[PDB]
Design a protein around this ligand. Structure first.
Ligand code: MN
Ligand code: MN
Ligand code: MN
Ligand code: MN
Lengths: 424, 421
């Protein structure tokens, strides 16, 4: 209980590195009231995920729901994947995020009205600030690029790119029937046959659990250097151009770098689709303090902190919203140059900018981080039409309906084939 | 999803029948040694617990470490709030979770009566030392900190802190007998301001040169051009360069501050280890762990190996003939001068053994500083495995009520808003 202060101290000295005025003082009475409601046809989509680790294996269940002005639409999925630290969580998150993105997009398509909107739980920036990626997953592309070369890679891309189009099709016309789908995720279904086509043909066995790979004749793995020593770069080059240079790689790193690559491309595809929605809004109870304020997009105040300040000084505690004057933009690092040419809306988003507002729906209510792809001005009123609490109703229905024993059945399975060993 | 149940099973069997080939090393048929018989021991079992709650952009954590063995219960405890960063918020928290138990198992050895003193940890030694527990975030701050105040000034900073660490470890021990517990097991929090008042602002955005290595940059790929640019050069020298590479960093008060809290945090982290390794008999029991870099020496996660032996052929243990050394680079040059118990473990290496007691219990992963045979029977003395159960049981999530206890107090001061979000 000694800490009980340190925290408080900590929590205060935090607040008051805000109380301290950087263009905030003024910006507060730059707080607008709420526009007037406008009639809209809306859908809100959240998702839940349940993970279970069994030995060095991870077993997850994703669910994503859209409630609203239409009937209820549902995507499901279940899987097992190699456990990791960075990468295990890393994969599943993307899949979770893609189920929702998919849903919002297909939902928008089933939505009748003059003015239509989709409403997502999260932020838009979260993906393009520090995506569920980390330096690790870009390597996966650059490795892939280098290993199977740019010709076959672009080939790989486009074939998968189109496969996903049909996928979206089957998926859509399934929702239309049963209002739900049990196989919304493509990648881990088509990865094997994609390995066998774009990889297994470029490779040979090597001594133990590895593969010998000729390097296509612009990026090359750092290994090639490391493998070459007594030699001048010249010969490293002449060996390159003469097509003799070759690497000895873990057959499995390669599969996972393929699987990542695909999981990645599919996640990106679904953002590109959902950006197709004209009025798209994100709602968040918390964005965060440090990350974005430092995002180099200059500085943001974290509604939890900022709300705290208002009632303190201006004494307001009034509903309304405060727009952040300068529209945001995803960095260059956060997203490849060569992949973008295949996503025109992500392209467009980068170029156009995101608009965002601290929005307080209710009297003494929480400030929400409201991000949108259209001026807060256009979308905010459409958003207000469905307001119920100090919050919006269909999200309240999307979130409370998005959320077990489903597991120990998946303990009760392998018998009929092999062994009960691991899950105990 | 009655379709994917097959797909799940598959992913499994594959990995199973894949362990069905060569990596046998086959001695499973023999090298399995039934149990060396019990020896007398004085034991201690440490485990830990973490409850984290997020409030807006600031994360709240509660740490409960607990040691139970022949002796009396010992409980170290912490509570803190820190700035949330995507992955690292979790990593500071686990590190301190690690620092609690290393620290705690040590002290239990320190006062333990007997000709035989064994501490029993829940976890793995490897998972500790493969890569820094906070990721190459920590190695970063260390270099920034280093480049910042200079090599020399840093060396003194370091020692200063190391010194401080014992002054603590002694006093903690003081409360550790009187009470048998302590609420400020971590200095890393109660010190830092001084140290920068001392080591930073006595000097003090700033431009910082730094190995491009430090942030975990290169490995990835290289474009053909950097090669052509260097053409007329040997490769060896080219790699010199990419290694040699510096870069500039521009740091506000926050980051400068942060790299510090990270650096010392890391420092107290390894301190609890170097100490803990002093234990003459130290065994790690882990049921399942991270096997990836492990093949990088063959091996298999326990429950994976188990199902194999059974599809081929009892209690008892299967050793591994070659102790695994940890990575030397995983810990920097300038630090290990300061840690022999670590420095030795890289030199020396750690012994791995698979273990099962009863008929139907799965096989755990056993690890030790000093070779299996000696240690194992010592542990086997205390079999249930009892000291474990209690070390674990009690340490677990004594209710989250400890969380929502903090809120209603704040408003007595000024503003409860964060307290709500
Ligand atoms: Mn959500
Ligand atoms: Mn939710
Ligand atoms: Mn534990
Ligand atoms: Mn435990």
């Amino acid at each position: 209980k000694q800490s009980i202060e340190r925290i408080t101290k900590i929590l205060l000295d935090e607040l008051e590195n805000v109380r301290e005025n950087e263009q905030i003082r003024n910006i507060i009475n730059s707080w607008k009231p709420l526009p007037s409601p406008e009639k809209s046809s809306i859908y809100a989509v959240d998702g839940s995920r349940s993970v279970s680790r069994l030995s060095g294996t991870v077993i997850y269940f994703l669910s994503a729901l859209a409630v609203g002005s239409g009937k209820q639409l549902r995507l499901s999925y279940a899987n097992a994947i190699k456990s990791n630290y960075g990468t295990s969580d890393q994969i599943v998150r993307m899949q979770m995020e893609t189920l929702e993105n998919m849903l919002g997009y297909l939902a928008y398509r089933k939505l009748e009205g003059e003015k239509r909107a989709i409403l997502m739980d999260g932020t838009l920036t979260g993906s393009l600030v520090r995506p569920p990626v980390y330096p690790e997953d870009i390597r996966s592309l650059n490795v892939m690029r280098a290993l199977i070369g740019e010709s076959d890679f672009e080939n790989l891309l486009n074939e998968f790119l189109e496969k996903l189009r049909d996928h979206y099709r089957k998926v859509e016309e399934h929702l239309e029937k049963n209002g739900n789908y049990d196989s919304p995720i493509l990648t881990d279904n088509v990865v094997e046959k994609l390995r066998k086509k774009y990889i297994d043909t470029k490779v040979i066995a090597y001594g133990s659990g590895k593969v010998k790979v000729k390097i296509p004749r612009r990026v090359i793995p750092i290994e090639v250097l490391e493998s070459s020593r007594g030699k001048s770069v010249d010969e490293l080059l002449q060996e390159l151009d003469e097509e003799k240079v070759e690497l000895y790689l873990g057959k499995d790193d390669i599969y996972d770098a393929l699987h990542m690559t695909l999981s990645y491309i599919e996640y990106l595809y679904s953002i590109d689709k959902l950006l197709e929605v004209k009025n798209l809004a994100y709602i968040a109870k918390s964005f965060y303090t440090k990350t974005l304020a430092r995002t180099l997009g200059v500085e943001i105040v974290d509604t939890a902190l900022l709300d705290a300040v208002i009632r303190t000084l201006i004494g307001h505690e009034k509903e309304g919203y405060l727009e952040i004057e300068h529209a945001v933009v995803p960095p260059k690092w956060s997203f490849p140059d060569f992949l973008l040419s295949k996503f025109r809306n992500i392209e467009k988003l980068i170029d156009k900018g995101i608009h965002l507002a601290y929005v307080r729906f209710e009297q003494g209510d929480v400030i929400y981080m409201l991000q949108s792809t259209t001026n807060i001005e256009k979308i905010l009123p459409l958003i207000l039409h469905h307001k119920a609490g100090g919050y919006l109703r269909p999200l309240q229905l999307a979130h409370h309906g998005v959320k077990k024993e489903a597991r120990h059945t998946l303990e009760a399975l392998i018998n009929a084939l092999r062994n009960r060993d691991p899950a105990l």
